Each structure stands twice: as C-alpha cells, then as structure tokens.
Amino acid sequence: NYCKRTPLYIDFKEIGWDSWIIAPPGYEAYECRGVCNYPLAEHLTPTKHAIIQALVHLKNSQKASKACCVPTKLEPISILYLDKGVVTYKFKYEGMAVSECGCR
Amino acid sequence: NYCKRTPLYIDFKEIGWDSWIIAPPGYEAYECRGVCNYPLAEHLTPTKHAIIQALVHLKNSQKASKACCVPTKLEPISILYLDKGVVTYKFKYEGMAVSECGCR
Amino acid sequence: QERLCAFKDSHENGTILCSKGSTCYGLWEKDINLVKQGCWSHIGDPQECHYEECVVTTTPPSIQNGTYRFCCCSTDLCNVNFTEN
Amino acid sequence: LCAFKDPHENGTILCSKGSTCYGLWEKINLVKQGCWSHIGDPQECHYEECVVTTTPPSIQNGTYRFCCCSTDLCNVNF
Amino acid sequence: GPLVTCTCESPHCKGPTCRGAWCTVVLVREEGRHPQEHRGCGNLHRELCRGRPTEFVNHYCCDSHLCNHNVSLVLEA
Amino acid sequence: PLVTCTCESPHCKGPTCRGAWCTVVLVREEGRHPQEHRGCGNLHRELCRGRPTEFVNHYCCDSHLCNHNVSLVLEA
C-alpha cells in the first residue's frame, strides 16, 4: 500500500535473546512496510532530499531510487535482564519500538 | 551491493525548480542505495530496532522486512532563490545533500 | 493517570510514583520469593497492559526450569500480588 | 576572504569553513555577493576566477549571471 | 498562524477535508500510467508550490477557503 | 581500553581493526551458504549474550587478536 506502521511481534526466545532477557518474553515492536509514492505526505516527516529523490525517480527510474519507508521515531521499552547472575531491571531500553514511520 | 553513499546529481531544470532557484543550477546530492545484511556494520549507525528487525527476517523473510539503506545525516548547501520577485540568499538550505548513510 | 506502585530493589519506603502512564510490574521466583517490583513502561505494549490485576497468563520462560513469574497491570498498587491462568 | 553584499565592514567578509566566493549579476546590475558553501560539490565554485560557464537559467528572461571562485577577492568582477 | 480548511482527495486522507496553512493540488504521472490528481493540505515545504510544471509533476497552492476543490491541472508533454 | 582484532567482514578497510571487543558472527540464511564475519565491536554488547540460533550465532572476546581462528556453530 503506502508507508504504514505495520505490526510486528518480536519473541525474544525465537531470536535467542531469552538467554539474558527474563521479561518480557516478547514486545510489540513495529515495522514500516509500504512504498513512498509521490506526493510524499507530511505526516511521514519527509526531508528535502527524500522529496528531491522521489522527483528524480518520477522522471527516470534508473538514475535514482524511490524513498524508503523507515522508522522516524523510536521509543524505548522496559526489560528485566541478568547482569552477572543478578536480576537487573531497566526502565528505558532505548530504540526498541517504533512510534512514527516516515520516508527518508 | 552494500549501504553506500552513491553519487546523484540533481539538475534543477529536470525537476522544474529553475523557475525560482537562480543558483546553483544543480548540486551534487547523494543517494543511499544498497542492502542491509546482518551483521549490520557500526559505520552505518544502526539502531536496536534495525538490528532486531533484520534478525526476524533471517528466521522468516515473510513476517518481517530488512533494514533499509537511508540517509542518516543531511548537510545544507547555499542557494540563491526568488521570493516574491526579490533575490533572496540562504547560507544553510538544510537537508539537501547526504553525508552519512545508514540502516534503519 | 499517574500510577503509584510497589518498589523492591522519587521513591520513599517501598513505593514509587510511576508517571507518564507507566504500569506496575512484579517479578517472583517460585517457595515464592520476591525479586523486584516497580514501574513498567507502556511502550513495551505487550497489549498495553491495561489489566486490572497482575496475571501471569504466559508460560514462564524456560530459563531456570520455569520459576520466574512476571506480570503487569494498570491499577495503582497492583504489583503487590500475582495470579495464575 | 570574499566581498559582501547581503541584506565584516563595508563590502568585505571573511568566508570560513572552506566556503567559496560567489557573485550574482543580471546582464549589468550587481545583485548579491558573499560566501558559498563548498558542500554540494559545484564544479564551478573551485575556479580561479568568476567565470559564467553555466548557461543562465531561463528565469527573468535570461538575465541572471552567476559564477563562483575559490580565490581571495575574486568575486569583485567576472 | 491563520489556518485554512482545504479538500482532501489523497489516499493518506483521514477525512473529506483537512486544515492547514495552504491547499495543495498535485499531478504525479510521468510515463507508463494515467495521471493521478491529489488534493490535500500543506503546512511545510512551500518550495514545491513555486516549481515550473514538468512532464511528470505540477504543483499549485492557494491561500483561501476550499480553493483547491475544482482546480484542474495539466502535465507537460 | 582499545584492543586490536581480526577483520574478515566485507565492510573491512584493513586486515585489523581497533575496538572495545572482538566479534565473530555466523550468518546462515535458509537455503544459503553460511557466512562467517570477523570484526570489532564498539556498541551493543547485548548481542554478545545471545543463544546460538539456527540462523545466527554471536561471539565476542576481549583479548588481543582473539578472533583470528574462532569457528562457531548454529543450531539445527
């Protein structure tokens, strides 16, 4: 469709991160899946380059490439991990979940 | 190939911006084109999401998508444009050229 | 709004004022001993954790042969006790 | 070091950070002068003199003459 | 600043009308397909509104109430 | 405290790099040839503690040229 915050669940046991992460077993991150077709919407916080990029893609698709649907604002989650055999607690595990998608 | 700052020249006459942009007629922008394959290199300033994202793509390529090679730091250029018939000069036209590429 | 929860590691004598919509979390190892308590970020978004009680609906992780019981809830001072199923 | 004409002391400016000297004309009145950022990689701003190698943009009926150079006090004349 | 209510005909629209600083009409087909007309609002990137019409894109912006409803655009050939 | 490690990744600028910990990464995609990567690590050491998976196995050592001949293994 278009640049959109499609859902994605990361089960830590499936990627091998359950060896050190006690809780949570998984957290709902989010993936930006879609295409960035002109006009680039302002709710995706586009840049002057990504807008200039898509314009050249309209003329010749060979010289330039389309803008990409990538996360623009990442928010942290809370975890309980094991540091040196002691259960440790982290309130802000930075950069784990996606709140806003955009074209860059 | 890989995430790389491939060259790109933006001729303002091709995008119709010569009607208001006096100088320069064009500037050597840059595009980030390539693939983000695990392991994600540190010189591509990866985030915890892009690392967690690519790992799920390794298990099942259908549920999740790869990280994208996108610009991470944009630098300004100097321009001479026409604002209401008066030549205006801007030293910092932000976000026009790409200095650093990365995976998000 | 701002949810006060129990604490076990401003905080003042076993409580903590969790702000910004954070939830109450509680960790145990089961002889049910209490490991830690405090605040839990809503951005974890397992389901936004808008539960009224601390319920360990998930099977405990296979580490330590399934002893750690973790849960979160969205009421004030709810991480004091947990449940099952 | 370049000349200055933007809306330093009376027509001069010390351009730093590798900036080049630029000069804008309409042909002949003088529009603006000052610094030009080296970012963007203009093939004409690393010149020894202000030479209008590029075709003037069709805007303003083909009057704007722009050039840049990378030497001190070069934007005083084309 | 003084916001204005425009018409929304883009796939990104949450309603039939939006509110913004200036209204936008975009034509966005170069080759291989039939031109598509977009209607929406504009709060940033006013540099697009002053661009000469090309064979693939045309930008129009007005600052009046519902001014971008029945504006007909055209692409160069 | 920097340490000199071995570089065998396609992103390498030289035979050796300098970093905080040395890294050995095994990256086999399904129905594809396993790829072994050797390099340095300056951030995100939480990866070094990851259980070996059927597609990825992270390895980190903090010794001089410790990542020269490290061979890893993936789960079935």
Residue numbers in the entry:
A (entry chain A), B (entry chain B): 321 to 424
C (entry chain I): 30 to 38, 52 to 72, 76 to 130
D (entry chain J): 33 to 39, 53 to 72, 77 to 127
E (entry chain E): 29 to 105
F (entry chain F): 30 to 105
Give me lines lifted from the publication on this model.
The TGF-β ligands are dimers and initiate signal transduction by forming a signalling complex with two copies of a type I receptor and two copies of a type II receptor; all are single-pass transmembrane proteins containing a small extracellular ligand-binding domain (ECD) and an intracellular kinase domain (ICD). Upon signalling complex formation, the constitutively active type II receptor phosphorylates and activates the type I receptor; subsequently the type I receptor phosphorylates Smad1/5 or Smad2/3 to regulate transcriptional responses. For example, ActRIIA/B bind to and mediate the signalling from both activin ligands and some BMP ligands, whereas BMPRII is the low-affinity type II receptor for over 15 BMP ligands. Of note, BMPRII is particularly highly expressed in lung vascular endothelial cells, where it mediates the signalling from circulating BMP9 and BMP10.
